[PDB]
Amino acid sequence: AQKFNGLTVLPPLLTDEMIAQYTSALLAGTITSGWTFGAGPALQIPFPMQMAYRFNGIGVTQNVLYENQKLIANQFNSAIGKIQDSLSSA
Amino acid sequence: RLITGRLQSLQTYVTQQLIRAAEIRASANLAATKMSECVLGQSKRVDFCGKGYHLMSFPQSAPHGVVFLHVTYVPAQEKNFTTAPAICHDGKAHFPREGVFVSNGTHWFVTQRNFYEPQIITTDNTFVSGNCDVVIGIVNNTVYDPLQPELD
Amino acid sequence: GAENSVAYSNNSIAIPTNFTISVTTEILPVSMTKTSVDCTMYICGDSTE
Amino acid sequence: CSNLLLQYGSFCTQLNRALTGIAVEQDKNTQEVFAQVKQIYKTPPIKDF
Ligand SMILES: *[C@@H]1O[C@H](CO)[C@@H](O[C@@H]2O[C@H](CO)[C@@H](O)[C@H](O)[C@H]2NC(C)=O)[C@H](O)[C@H]1NC(C)=O
Ligand SMILES: *[C@@H]1O[C@H](CO)[C@@H](O[C@@H]2O[C@H](CO)[C@@H](O)[C@H](O)[C@H]2NC(C)=O)[C@H](O)[C@H]1NC(C)=O
Ligand SMILES: *[C@@H]1O[C@H](CO)[C@@H](O[C@@H]2O[C@H](CO)[C@@H](O)[C@H](O)[C@H]2NC(C)=O)[C@H](O)[C@H]1NC(C)=O
Ligand SMILES: *[C@@H]1O[C@H](CO)[C@@H](O)[C@H](O)[C@H]1NC(C)=O
Numbered sequence: 046a047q048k049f050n051g052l053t054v055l056p057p058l059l060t061d062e063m064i065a066q067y068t069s070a071l072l073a074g075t076i077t078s079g080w081t082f083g084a085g086p087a088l089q090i091p092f093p094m095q096m097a098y099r100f101n102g103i104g105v106t107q108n109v110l111y112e113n114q115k116l117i118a119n120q121f122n123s124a125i126g127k128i129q130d131s132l133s134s135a
Numbered sequence: 136r137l138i139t140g141r142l143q144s145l146q147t148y149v150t151q152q153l154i155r156a157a158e159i160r161a162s163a164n165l166a167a168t169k170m171s172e173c174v175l176g177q178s179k180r181v182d183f184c185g186k187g188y189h190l191m192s193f194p195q196s197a198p199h200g201v202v203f204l205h206v207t208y209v210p211a212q213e214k215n216f217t218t219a220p221a222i223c224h225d226g227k228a229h230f231p232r233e234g235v236f237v238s239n240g241t242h243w244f245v246t247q248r249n250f251y252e253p254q255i256i257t258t259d260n261t262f263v264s265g266n267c268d269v270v271i272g273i274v275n276n277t278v279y280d281p282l283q284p285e286l287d
Numbered sequence: 288g289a290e291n292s293v294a295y296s297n298n299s300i301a302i303p304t305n306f307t308i309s310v311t312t313e314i315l316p317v318s319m320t321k322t323s324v325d326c327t328m329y330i331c332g333d334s335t336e
Numbered sequence: 337c338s339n340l341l342l343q344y345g346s347f348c349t350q351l352n353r354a355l356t357g358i359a360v361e362q363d364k365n366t367q368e369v370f371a372q373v374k375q376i377y378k379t380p381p382i383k384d385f
C-alpha cells in the first residue's frame with residue numbers, strides 16, 4: 046500500500062452504497078414521474094405517455110408512438126442489451 | 136538563504152493566487168452565463184436557474200460578487216386521475232392536440248397537462264389519425280362535433 | 288432522505304390543480320480584492336546589499 | 337528535524353490547509369451530482385411498463 050509513510054487516505058463521506066441508492070432513487074423518479082419530481086412534487090405518469098411527451102419536443106407527433114409501441118419497445122430493449130454486452134467487453 | 140526562502144514563499148503565494156483567480160474566473164463565467172440566460176430572458180434549461188420551472192430572475196449587487204433572486208414555478212396541490220392515450224368514437228382514433236384525456240367517474244375530459252381545467256371533448260381539441268385496432272389502451276366515447284348544431 | 292413510494296399504473300396520472308410562487312437564493316462571487324506585491328519592499332528593506 | 341521545521345511550519349500550515357481544502361472540495365463535489373433529490377422513491381412491485 047501507500048499508507049506506510051504518513052500518506053494516509055481519507056474515506057469518502059458517501060460510500061458506494063449511498064451512491065447506488067441515490068442513482069436508484071433518481072432512476073425510479075425519472076421512470077415513474079418524468080421531470081416533475083426534479084422540478085417540484087413527484088407526480089405519476091405512465092411510461093408510454095412520458096415517451097409521447099418526449100416525442101412531442103423534437104418535432105414529431107404522439108400517434109406515431111401509439112401505433113408502433115411494440116417496435117419502439119423492442120428497439121429500446123435491444124439497445125439496452127447491446128450497450129450492456131458492449132460494456133461487458135474499459 | 137533569506138532571499139531564497141522569501142522567493143519560495145512569494146512563489147507559493149503567487150501560485151495560490153493564480154489558482155484562486157482561475158476559480159474566480161470559472162465562477163464569474165458561470166455568473167455571466169446565468170445573467171445572460173435566466174436574467175436576460177427565460178431559460179429553458181431545467182434545474183439551472185433554481186428548483187422548479189423558471190419564470191424570471193432579479194439580480195442584485197453584492198460586495199465582490201452577485202446574487203440572483205430567481206422566480207420559480209412549483210406546484211403545490213395534486214390529484215389522482217384515470218387517463219387514456221386515445222379515444223375511439225366511430226372506427227376512428229382521436230388524440231389530444233395540446234392536452235390529456237382524464238375521467239373522474241363516468242365522463243371524459245381534455246385538460247392541459249400542467250394545470251387542471253376540464254373541457255368537453257370535441258373535434259376541435261382532438262385530431263383523427265387511423266382506426267381503433269392499432270392502439271392498445273383505447274376507450275369508447277362520443278365527440279361533440281360543434282358544427283352540427285350550428286349548421287342546423 | 289424521506290423514504291416514500293410513488294404509486295405507478297399504466298392508466299393513472301397525477302396533474303396539479305394549484306401552484307405556489309417561490310424565490311430561490313443563489314450566491315455567486317465574481318471578484319475579490321486585488322493586491323500588488325513587489326520584491327523590493329517585501330524581500331528587501333532599506334539596504335542596498 | 338522538528339527544531340529546524342519550526343522555521344517552515346508556516347509552509348507546512350499552508351500545505352495542510354490546501355490539502356484540507358482539497359479533501360472538503362472532493363467531499364462537496366459528490367453532493368452536487370448525486371444528491372439532487374431529497375426523497376427516496378421506489379419502483380412498483382409489478383414491472384409492467
Ligand atoms: C364527473 O364530472 C362531471 C362534470 O363535472 C359530473 O357531472 C355533473 O355532476 C353534477 C353533480 O350532480 C350535476 O349537477 C351536473 O349536471 C353533471 N354534469 C353533466 C354534464 O352531467 C359528474 O357528477 C362527476 N362524477 C363524479 C363521480 O364526481
Ligand atoms: C367499444 O366499442 C366497440 C364498438 O362499438 C366494441 O366492440 C364490439 O364489442 C362487442 C362485444 O364486446 C362485439 O360483439 C362487437 O362486434 C364489437 N364491435 C366492433 C366494431 O368491434 C367494444 O367492445 C367497446 N369496448 C368497451 C370496453 O365497451
Ligand atoms: C392555492 O394555494 C393558495 C396558497 O395557500 C391558496 O390561497 C389561500 O386561500 C385561503 C382560502 O381561500 C386563504 O385563507 C389564504 O389566505 C390564501 N393564501 C394566500 C397566500 O393567498 C389558494 O386558495 C389555493 N387554491 C386552490 C384552488 O386550492
Ligand atoms: C387517489 O390518490 C391516492 C394517492 O396515493 C392513490 O393511492 C389512489 O389510488 C388514487 N385513487 C385512484 C382511484 O386511483
Ligand SMILES: *[C@@H]1O[C@H](CO)[C@@H](O)[C@H](O)[C@H]1NC(C)=O
Binds near residue numbers: 271272297298384
Ligand atoms: C395495465 O396493467 C395491468 C397489469 O399488467 C393489466 O391488467 C391492464 O390490462 C393494463 N391496462 C392497460 C390499459 O394496458
